RNA sequence: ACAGGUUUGGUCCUGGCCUUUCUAUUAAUUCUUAAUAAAAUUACACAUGCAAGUAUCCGCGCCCCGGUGAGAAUGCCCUCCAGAUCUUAAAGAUCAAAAGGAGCAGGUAUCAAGCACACCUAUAACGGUAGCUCAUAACGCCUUGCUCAACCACACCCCCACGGGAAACAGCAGUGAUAAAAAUUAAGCCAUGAACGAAAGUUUGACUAAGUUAUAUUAAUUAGAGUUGGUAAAUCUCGUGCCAGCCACCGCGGUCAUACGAUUAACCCAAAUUAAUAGAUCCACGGCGUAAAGAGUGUUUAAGAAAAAAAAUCACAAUAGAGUUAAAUUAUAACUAAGCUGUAAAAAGCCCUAGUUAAAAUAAAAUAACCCACGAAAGUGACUCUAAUAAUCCUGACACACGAUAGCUAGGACCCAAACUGGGAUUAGAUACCCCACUAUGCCUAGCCCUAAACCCAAAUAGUUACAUAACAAAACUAUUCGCCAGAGUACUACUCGCAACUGCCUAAAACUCAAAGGACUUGGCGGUGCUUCACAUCCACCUAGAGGAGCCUGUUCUAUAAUCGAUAAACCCCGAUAGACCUUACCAACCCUUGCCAAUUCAGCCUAUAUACCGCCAUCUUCAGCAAACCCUAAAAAGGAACAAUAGUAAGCACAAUCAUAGCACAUAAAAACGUUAGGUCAAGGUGUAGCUUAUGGGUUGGAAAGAAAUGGGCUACA
């Protein structure tokens, strides 16, 4: 019966479970190395503005925040 | 659901449709990369002869031969078609039989 | 769609996949001739010949036709017309750029924010506001000519061509390279159209007439292809033996194949026929308790829907505070006894233990509750007091505020419980279930996390009980809404977005694989489920006499032999044998015989292969009560079908029972014991279907076999 389904599932899940841990630090760096991307790609947004609306510098008291490496 | 609903997200439309083996065409060009051999799935059992080939589209498949003998060498050229085969897995192409370098499976007469 | 095949032992239900119809390329197999239409892989590169000229100068023409579909979500549709040209006694007409907007317009929201995308001043280029677009899809990304008496776009590329690469057939023919994709380097301006001409007229690879090609229709002169298990028209004999192979789906091949390969007959199409690949067609105005789908909860925005009634009260346990404690337990003393704890049984464990008598903190709240209240839901039931339970009450989010347990951060608390872990048992193992300790943790204060079988699997608000049974469950439905569902896996997954999370939450795909996956039911069978009732040589308890040990007999099994076969869980093993020295005899070894028992036969003869082709005879459930035609019933039937103060069953038959036999009764024993089950036993009793052998798998003569290292079944005789 329905059971039957969610067998499948809690099989899935376990097994999924156990992936995770084996492969965290694998994971782990992964992650970062994406939110290393994400701020970067975040700045060039920016950048492309001050170049698309002509300053040649960045605008005055602009440090450009890094909120996806946000920690602690 | 609702005619609002209905009104919102329009009518349905007939998704288009998947190209499968061939990528649309009905034959391909082939090039022979090894001839060799396949078993089939469970209630029935036999042993089919497959080549592996490269096709116009730069890509390689796996492709089936029918008919019982033939004469198959690397650096043939085949002509194949999208006939998927029933016995084996993912085998979805099958070799023209009679052009360029498969003849006609022969006659025992 | 007039539908059909396919899930299961079967039945519905849900739900994909496929068949059947029509068109187009390309391929394979065939191919006779005309006529007519159509002609096409390639914005890859192009040899050569041509595709604009006219005309008394000047002028006028010179991507106009013609080609292409590269680009662009391009655009369709509809306003409004600058300009160019034509006509003409100045206003008509044809194209129509730019610029606009009623409406319609590819996919994707995993592209959700874009980043100045607005306006105001008529001052006369400066000032002033702080706006505009966007979930009714902005801004992206991806694919793409089209809505077709035509329209849009390009013209070697750099969207645009100054300039730069570089030297352009996407004009007609042709050609390399590329691709499943193959027309003549052809003749004429004779008709039409175009350009010029005052005109005859000249040019025109536009076009006209041909040429090539089964690409499509038509006509006949032309016969071939595919099929033949089912869906779905149509089959005989061989060969092959899960091999060679076939199928679009279900499937076919494991020795007797209408599914393979080949014959033989047929079927159906037919100058075509099949195969392939693209289309046309194809979901849902259907659903959401159990099937895929009602979000964990409420309110509001945006957007909508609207006759009348629609705030009454806790039968009292919302929430948040602050204060309080009855039972129990624990520290810790006083006595007293050596044990105490703990299981199916124990062990370890503790004796700073146990019983009694005292006793704070912490934690948790018997009975009442057979009640059914309060909160939006989560949740809430010891006591008291304070504060207190939105809306004159329709729906509503990605917005807002909450949200069990567990978990995380910091600080307290610690009676008891307890993941983890360490002992102890159990066990083949026991990282578990049982035992014993002890920890994170449950507890408070503050902050997070935001998940549940967050389920009553049943959305909100008004209604009705009309119509009506798929099944099961909680009986069937309107109306208004929002939310959600397009086979199954893959997948509470990969990538994205956002979050005090960084083994997280949320949102949530595709490749690939399969022809299913699912829901409910029906009879069986099964159950270390529960309940009753039995077992009468029978499970237990009980009684007697034996087997297993010893010698021997005899049968298997193994080794040995040149040297039978069959049986071999219960249902083989002193078995076919109520019976092998030769014979029997089927076996091995040598020799020999070929119409070789008979009335006749290209005929005899075969203990050769099939017991999974069989008839015969039996075993077995079984000393079990059922089997089965003919009917009858069931808001449908796969199947079921009784109640005796009776509710849909009737029925001859075969079983049981009854009678027979064991020389009178009776009981006992004997016999009997269907339907089926075990593809149980036996082609060596005999007979046979299918296959094989025929100077031999046939028929004769002569010898030879049946030895024991053991291992075991049953007997016999003992042990006095
Ligand atoms: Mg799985
Ligand atoms: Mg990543
Ligand atoms: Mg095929
Ligand atoms: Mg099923
Ligand atoms: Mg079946
Ligand atoms: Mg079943
Ligand atoms: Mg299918
Ligand atoms: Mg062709
Ligand atoms: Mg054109
Ligand atoms: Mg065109
Ligand atoms: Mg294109
Ligand atoms: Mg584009
Ligand atoms: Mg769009
Ligand atoms: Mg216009
Ligand atoms: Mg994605
Ligand atoms: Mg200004
Ligand atoms: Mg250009
Ligand atoms: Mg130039
Ligand atoms: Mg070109
Ligand atoms: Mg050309
Ligand atoms: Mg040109
Ligand atoms: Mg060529
Ligand atoms: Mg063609
Ligand atoms: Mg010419
Ligand atoms: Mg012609
Ligand atoms: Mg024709
Ligand atoms: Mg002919
Ligand atoms: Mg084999
Ligand atoms: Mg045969
Ligand atoms: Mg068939
Ligand atoms: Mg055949
Ligand atoms: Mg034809
Ligand atoms: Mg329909
Ligand atoms: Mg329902
Ligand atoms: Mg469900
Ligand atoms: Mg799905
Ligand atoms: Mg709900
Ligand atoms: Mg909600
Ligand atoms: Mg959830
Ligand atoms: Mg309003
Ligand atoms: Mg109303
Ligand atoms: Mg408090
Ligand atoms: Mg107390
Ligand atoms: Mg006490
Ligand atoms: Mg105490
Ligand atoms: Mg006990
Ligand atoms: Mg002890
Ligand atoms: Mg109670
Ligand atoms: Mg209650
Ligand atoms: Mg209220
Ligand atoms: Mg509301
Ligand atoms: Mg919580
Ligand atoms: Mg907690
Ligand atoms: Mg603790
Ligand atoms: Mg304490
Ligand atoms: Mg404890
Ligand atoms: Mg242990
Ligand atoms: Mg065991
Ligand atoms: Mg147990
Ligand atoms: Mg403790
Ligand atoms: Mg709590
Ligand atoms: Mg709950
Ligand atoms: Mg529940
Ligand atoms: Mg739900
Ligand atoms: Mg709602
Ligand atoms: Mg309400
Ligand atoms: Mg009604
Ligand atoms: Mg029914
Ligand atoms: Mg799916
Ligand atoms: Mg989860
Ligand atoms: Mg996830
Ligand atoms: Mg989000
Ligand atoms: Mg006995
Ligand atoms: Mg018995
Ligand atoms: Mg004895
Ligand atoms: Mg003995
Ligand atoms: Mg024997
Ligand atoms: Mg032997
Ligand atoms: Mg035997
Ligand atoms: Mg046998
Ligand atoms: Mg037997
Ligand atoms: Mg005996
Ligand atoms: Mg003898
Ligand atoms: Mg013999
Ligand atoms: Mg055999
Ligand atoms: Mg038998
Ligand atoms: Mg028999
Ligand atoms: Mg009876
Ligand atoms: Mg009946
Ligand atoms: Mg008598
Ligand atoms: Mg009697
Ligand atoms: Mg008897
Ligand atoms: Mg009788
Ligand atoms: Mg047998
Ligand atoms: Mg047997
Ligand atoms: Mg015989
Ligand atoms: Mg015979
Ligand atoms: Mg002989
Ligand atoms: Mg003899
Ligand atoms: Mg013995
Ligand atoms: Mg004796």
Redesign the pocket.
């Known amino acids: 019966?329905?059971?039957?389904?969610?067998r499948?599932?809690?099989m899935?899940?376990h097994k999924?479970?156990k992936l995770?841990?084996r492969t965290?630090f694998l994971?782990?760096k992964?992650?970062?190395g994406?939110?290393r991307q994400?701020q970067v790609?975040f700045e060039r947004?920016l950048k492309?503005?001050w170049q698309?609306?002509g300053l040649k510098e960045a605008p005055a008291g602009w440090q450009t925040p890094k909120?996806?490496?946000?920690?602690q | 659901?609702?005619?609002?609903?209905?009104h919102?997200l329009?009518?349905?439309?007939?998704?288009?449709?998947?190209?499968?083996?061939?990528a649309?065409?009905?034959?391909?060009?082939g090039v022979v990369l090894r001839t060799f051999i396949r078993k089939?799935?469970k209630?029935?059992?036999?042993?089919?002869?497959c080549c592996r080939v490269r096709?116009?589209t730069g890509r390689e498949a796996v492709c089936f031969i029918?008919?019982?003998?033939?004469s198959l060498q690397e650096h043939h050229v085949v002509?194949v078609?999208?006939?998927?085969?029933?016995?084996?897995?993912?085998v979805?192409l099958?070799v023209?039989?009679?052009?360029y370098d498969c003849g006609?499976v022969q006659?025992?007469?």
């Open positions: 019966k329905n059971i039957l389904k969610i499948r599932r809690k899935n899940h999924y479970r995770v841990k965290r994971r782990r992964v992650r970062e994406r939110l994400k790609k947004d492309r503005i698309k609306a909120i996806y490496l946000k920690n | 659901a609702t005619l609002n609903q209905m919102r329009g009518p349905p439309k007939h998704p288009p449709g998947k190209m499968g083996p061939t649309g065409r009905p034959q391909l060009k089939p799935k209630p029935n059992s036999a042993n089919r002869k096709l116009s029918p008919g019982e003998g033939h002509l078609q999208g006939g998927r085969t029933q016995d084996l897995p993912g979805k099958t023209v039989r009679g052009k006609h006659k025992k007469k």
